């Protein structure tokens, strides 16, 4: 049985609270059994236990910043799996802060995970700051 894992790199967009991602830099996409769809979601072919994680660095100046790992399963409404908050910095022009989210979840075939934040324009895209991934147990 192949190893199933993905690690995708943050991507800015002038377009929404859903973060975008790219397969570029030091990314991982072990095979077609996980895909990055529409630059926004990691979608799994196979039911099972996965460790799913996200880290988000943002740069803000002073409602908290919230990042949410969301699940869209076939036939089900979107739901939050994990959420992390951080007060806005007072640093000028902005202060950087990081959030890490991670945990083990049952995914159904064709299930998709994505990351939403209070302000996508404030996310830091410098090398290594913001990433999203999963591995099948």
């Amino acid at each position: 049985n192949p190893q199933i894992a993905a690690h995708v790199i943050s991507e800015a967009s002038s377009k929404t609270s859903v973060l975008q991602w790219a397969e570029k830099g030091y990314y991982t996409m072990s095979n077609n059994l996980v895909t990055l769809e529409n630059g926004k979601q990691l979608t799994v072919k196979r039911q099972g236990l996965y460790y799913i994680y996200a880290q988000v660095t943002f740069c803000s100046n002073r409602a908290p910043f919230i990042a949410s790992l969301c699940l869209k399963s076939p036939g089900r409404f979107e739901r939050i799996l994990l959420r992390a908050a951080n007060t806005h910095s007072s640093a000028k022009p902005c202060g950087q802060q990081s959030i890490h989210l991670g945990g083990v979840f049952e995914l159904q075939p064709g299930a998709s995970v994505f990351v939403n934040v209070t302000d996508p324009s404030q996310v830091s895209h410098g090398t290594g700051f913001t990433s999203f991934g999963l591995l099948k147990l």
Partner: antibody
Amino acid sequence: QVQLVQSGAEVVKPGASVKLSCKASGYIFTSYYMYWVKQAPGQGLELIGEINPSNGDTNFNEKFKSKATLTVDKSASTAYMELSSLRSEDTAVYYCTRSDGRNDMDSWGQGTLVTVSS
Amino acid sequence: DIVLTQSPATLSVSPGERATISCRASQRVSSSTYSYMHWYQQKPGQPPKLLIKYASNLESGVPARFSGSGSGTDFTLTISSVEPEDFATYYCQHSWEXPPTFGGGTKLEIKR
């Protein structure tokens, strides 16, 4: 029309600083990344760094980390780059450009010539 | 850092001739969905102008005679039929990782 208008040419001595401006119009200034690019006489294009006008967050090409300072004035839709301890090797045309995704750079300023000479 | 090598350094063509130029990256800049390679035109004293984004996408307002192709380490820009306003230097750029770098340029020169 999307437009980036840069400040006029500078002729300075070594040890000087200059502050270059890039005035954006015809789009939502905070929605696009801005890059500064160096083109030395007869030469190609060299990335200096990027700024997110939304918050002021910057990333630099390691070469320009001590040479360049990037800021914005959101209210004036203007980006600025300060170049410090200028030497003859800083002689170049400097561009500001916008980027919707930090991939392609879809609009460029006309360039500002900086001449550093004793 | 990624290095982009453009060939040829100079291409001599007439108006009404097809021009193809190439860009070779020091490592692959393609993945499942996109190639992070962009092409620009620059005339002397003028800023670069975007022509092709993500290897093959014609920038809005750019004439249909411009096209881009390629994947992995190797990319081409083609002008189907050169016009007088096309003589210029052409530059490739990656957006694969930090920093973005540009090729050394291909000069499209008037053949006689």
